[PDB]
Amino acid sequence: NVENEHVEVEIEKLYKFSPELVYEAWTKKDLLKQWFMTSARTNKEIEADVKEGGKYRIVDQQRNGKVNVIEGIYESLVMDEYVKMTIGMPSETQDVIEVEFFERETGGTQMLFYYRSLVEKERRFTNLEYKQKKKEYHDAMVHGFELMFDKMYHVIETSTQQ
Ligand code: NA
Question: How far away, in angstroms, is 90 Cα from ligand 1 center?
Fold first, then answer.
């Protein structure tokens, strides 16, 4: 649809953890299973082939027997430095995640997260209605990723105490 536009989410987090510890959260299966679109208790399946061009597949338990399936690809993996991945399998577009890890002087890491997602324009939508749907979608994604990263934060914290 020539008319579908992207929302973009930009998130900066500062952690005391080393870039290596944060990068690991993104690239290790039994860590990702705890935070990335899933959690320890709701995770049904996770497969992750963590190399460039490799697939991941997360099945997450929702209410009343329903399931969420999340699949995508690692496009770029540079050690302690950079992950580019898709949400969506190259019906329905791929969202893009690009996340960079920088070492601070002081802390462990500055984490710079970028996300791009195509929002579908509905039949007969006014300019305002479309703009309102992208704003709602953006705020929902900001909130869902915040909740994820702060979950990711405790998963990292509890490998540091246990
Ligand atoms: Na997906």
Answer: 10
- Resolution as reported, in Å: 2.3
Residue ranges per structural domain of the chain:
1-162
Cα(14) to centroid(ligand 1), Å = 28
Q: How far is the CA of 58 from the centre of ligand 1 (A)?
A: 9
Query: Comparing C-alpha atoms, which of 40, 35, 47, 97 is closest to residue 71?
Result: 47
**Residue among 78, 100, 132 nearest 11 (CA):** 100
C-alpha span between 116 and 97 (Å, rounded)? 7
What span, in angstroms and rounded, lies between the C-alpha atoms of 111 and 86? 18
Fold entry, domain 1-162: Alpha-D-Glucose-1,6-Bisphosphate; Chain A, domain 4 (3.30.530)
Distance 85 CA to ligand 1 centre (A): 12
Q: Which two tokens stand for residue 86?
A: 């898709």
- DSSP state letters, 58-73: EEEE-GGG-EEEEEEE
Q: Which helix (H) or strand (E) holds 102?
A: strand 95-103
Residue 107 vs residues 38, 42, 98, 100: alpha-carbon distances, Å: 28, 32, 22, 16
Q: Dihedral (C-alpha) 14, 16, 20, 24: value to the nearest 10 degrees?
A: -80
